[model samples]
Target: SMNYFVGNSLGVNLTGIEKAIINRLNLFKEMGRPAQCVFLSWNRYLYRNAQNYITSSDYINMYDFFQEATYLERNEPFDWLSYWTDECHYTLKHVENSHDFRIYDQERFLMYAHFQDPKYRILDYVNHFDSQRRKVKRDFYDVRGFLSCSRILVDKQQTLCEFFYNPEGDTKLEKYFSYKDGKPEVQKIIVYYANKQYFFNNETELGAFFIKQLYQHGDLFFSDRNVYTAPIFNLTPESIPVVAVLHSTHIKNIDALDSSPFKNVYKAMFENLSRYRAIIVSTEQQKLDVEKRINHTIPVVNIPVGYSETIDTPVQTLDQRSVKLISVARYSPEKQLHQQIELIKRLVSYVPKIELHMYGFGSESKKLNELIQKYGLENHVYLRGFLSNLDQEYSDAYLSLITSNMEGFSLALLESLAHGVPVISYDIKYGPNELITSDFNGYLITKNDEDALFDKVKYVIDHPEVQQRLSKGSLAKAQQYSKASLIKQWDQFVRLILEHHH
Candidate 1:
């Protein structure tokens, strides 16, 4: 008989699909003590509370739209309000203002609940709210004037507690009180540091800086408290295990390799992470990368992140007049965005009616725009930034393309095939070779070979009958990665991990 399953917290993916895995694991109950089994989440928000009653209508709407959008708003730092409002003309000049709709609704009534002032200082209510107030130095366009940007928190009476000249200046102050206790006030503050702030000024700089602050703010609130330790809360024995999922070595290298602000802070955090029982990684390759960069031999375990779940959803083949090509990746530098652009450029010449949609957003939007312009392939290539229904994108398109030098397991590849869409990716170290069998469902071309990538993509896009055949067979091949199989694997792993610990 199994006593309990204790989950490790660090470097684990916790949002969207991965959270669903924890929900599945919770199904195991001994009919005795329920508290024996536990899965620690990355944040408080990831906490799974049991309730007898859930309205079907509310669940459907919440599942389809609200939950996914909320995940993006919180997880994707690039899409947050401060970033959208301030930087990137494409957002500022076009997208609607995203700030108005209160995120928590009546639950947030605490802000204005006690205080009549519309400016409900939330800093007073929560311990770490002051850290938020400290991060805001000046507005995007404000050149001369700097601002402390009064804390969203305040005293029970709704008056400002402490104010600073600017966000940068706020960090200088040694102390601030969560409450104006006459006795020595506790130093409750989390510093906001952006390594690249000096490189960018104005909107991008302001936007990026504030986004980091918002991320740190949301990190405590949005993550599953049951799984993660709050950086600000400083819980005794740490009720939660917070795992900051390092998706790529590049991001970590930005901190570890160069003498950047993150170099010291992140280094220390990683050192402390060794104290945690385990760290979760997607693939063996990533484990090696983390080991090399951080120089830590801490226990690392490989989990699929949630590829198996996508395969469970019924694969639907959309009948279309024209062949559809899809590229579902955050537009970024690491993805060999230029190589993908070239593939589309070459493929478009052969098939005049072909349509390619690249979903997800990143810093490369501007460069992508220029590349599209330079190649004059705007009509053929569609840049769909920050798409919510990535499964739908995979379902509709005939083929999927990935052009990244690095990936863990390539969730998008599994997802695409799960939805009956064949894939063509530059054969990389881990993701492509592991997921795609060359000429089986998709082609895995030589890594960084623009010409080879183009040829493989064009071959599939031009041939209609082959594309359909591959799609059907691809769905068949994808069955092995189904949610049922993957979940069972997870259940067994959890039992083993717990037994080993005991």
Candidate 2:
């Protein structure tokens, strides 16, 4: 099985990765490749003891957003496994008249308790192994008060391991006992409230002692996290291949790539470029830029994160659509959704009938609302919240807008074009330059230039024919990214890598 290491399976932001995985699975089957895809998640707190499956309700919720591509036992076939970290601890309590225990977390994840009867007489504390949900380390709860317990001996692998007493009567460790094998070693002392100082034998010992033990040798693997990369290289044999997919702009500032330092994510990986099989990016411009930075030490492939061979034939035609603009993105800082609200305020002044509909949820929701209110755009701009199904919304829109400074690949750009709507995006580092053919398929405004964006919207309003021309161009351009063509690209690359595998 080919493994895809996605950090978590709990957000709509991961939909692009999900789509690519499902498409790859279909390609593998059709091509008769002797391989299946498995999504290995690092976090299991949400679906612990769930037989390595997400709950049906949660799956259903994901399905509404992802459509039939959602993997399920009764539906499409795929495997997903979650590895719970050591930090996850579950508690058990004894039931009356029965020699059985009921599990509870009591919302106190750091602490676990064991009871003897229905009255819940405290017995001791236990640590659970997430993989099997079985208690491994048991510690006695030395009672310090009527309702409190403290001064307990801690026994954990790669963590606290001796007379680790929590003087504050809380889970946060202040002073802990260290052990070398079975004997008492040294004391781990902390001074600040949050800063921790690991006083092990040496820096080398501390790093060696905390290495994770959760990787398997594989033919190929894909990762999205920086922390996940080191372990794959450290744990596996040198011959196995690992691909690091760049899901964001690697440099801090797109406009000032030469001046700005490489972001921490790209810095570490590029420094160890020899260890990686390939660094995959979504746009040609990004591929070129990355190669220039790494001095061509490794291959950087440009592969769009989205694929659609044919344009969506919507239920409603262009003639039936309103003069509405739509943007589908998380209300996050990176997206600069406030800029979209500002653009909407500009669009409304030109065409009073025009409306801007924002479909998403994030930490910026409240801020976006305040911006709309501040601009008195209550009538023109609407925050539609998160929509699991956006086909109809795309069908109803005349155009789409992207205001982000950078993008790995704008899935929204492809989705809008597939639904017969063109896009106007900031001419940023990556996606827009590749996806949009300025003034042909769509408009690419100067990065953060409000006048250029305003004028483009005005032009579309003045000439209805521009929208039709752009929409048709969008449909034609989308064929290049069709699932069939993209799958062929993926198959060829994988086979080439496997053939040359050492």
The RMSD of every model to the true structure, in order and in angstroms, is 14.9, 12.1
Tens-digit lDDT track of model 2 for 379-487: 8889999997787787768888888876667776777777778888888777888889987788988888978888887788678789888888888777778878777
Clashing pairs in 2: 309-482
In terms of TM-score, how similar is model 1 to the real structure? Answer: 0.54
TM-score of each model, paired residue for residue? 0.54, 0.66
Mind giving the per-residue lDDT tens digits that candidate 1 earns over 266-296? Answer: 3434546643445555566666655555556
RMSD score of candidate 2 (Å): 12.1
